[PDB]
Design a protein around this ligand. Sequence first.
Ligand SMILES: Nc1ncnc2c1ncn2[C@@H]1O[C@H](COP(=O)(O)OP(=O)(O)O)[C@@H](O)[C@H]1O
Ligand SMILES: Nc1ccn([C@@H]2O[C@H](COP(=O)(O)O)[C@@H](O)[C@H]2O)c(=O)n1
Ligand SMILES: [Mg+2]
Length: 191
Amino acid sequence: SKPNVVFVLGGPGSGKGTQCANIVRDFGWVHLSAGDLLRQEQQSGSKDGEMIATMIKNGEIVPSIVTVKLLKNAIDANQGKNFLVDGFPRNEENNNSWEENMKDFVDTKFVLFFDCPEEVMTQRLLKRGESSGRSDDNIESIKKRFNTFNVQTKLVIDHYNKFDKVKIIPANRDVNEVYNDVENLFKSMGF
Ligand SMILES: Nc1ncnc2c1ncn2[C@@H]1O[C@H](COP(=O)(O)OP(=O)(O)O)[C@@H](O)[C@H]1O
Ligand SMILES: Nc1ccn([C@@H]2O[C@H](COP(=O)(O)O)[C@@H](O)[C@H]2O)c(=O)n1
Ligand SMILES: [Mg+2]
């Protein structure tokens, strides 16, 4: 059987990695964070590394040929699993490249959208910034990540919503309250 795929979207610091860890724990899906895979690719000393580094710091979206390749490598290595793909698609190019490369391999089911205010997301990330040692957890970068979300990614969420394919969870609540709804949703979808 073809894998089920759920895209996990929402702003920087909306809690995507956090909720995805919980789903992995209770449902046994594999968690693919596109941002983390792109970091890993840079730390592994490829030709694209200096490119990826710069784009991450500036909150720009890497060319899809890089990203879709890393997601596909991991997907092909885990036959018989279902996938949470987190922080992807972030723009139209991401999306077109997914449907060009993945369409008859996967059953992409819905977009799980974590809706959260910008001011709350800012505070979360400045707190993760003390200990994360990430290049994009400073105020300069966070604001660049917001704008890219606003200009590029919001259009993608709209696209999936006109096919009734977006499920929205409000994420400005306690972590366990947010997970309660996430778990209820995944159970109701038959997973
Ligand atoms: N519901 C929440 N309330 C408060 N802190 C949270 C909540 N969800 C996540 N966090 C914290 O917010 C920060 C960002 O979480 P993360 O899952 O990495 O976000 P994303 O992947 O969407 O950028 C982390 O420090 C995390 O521990
Ligand atoms: N689909 C994706 C996902 C992440 N990214 C890059 O990785 C950065 C970090 O992503 P996360 O916030 O999701 O960890 C993004 O802000 C962006 O610069 C990307 O270029 N393409
Ligand atoms: Mg993340």
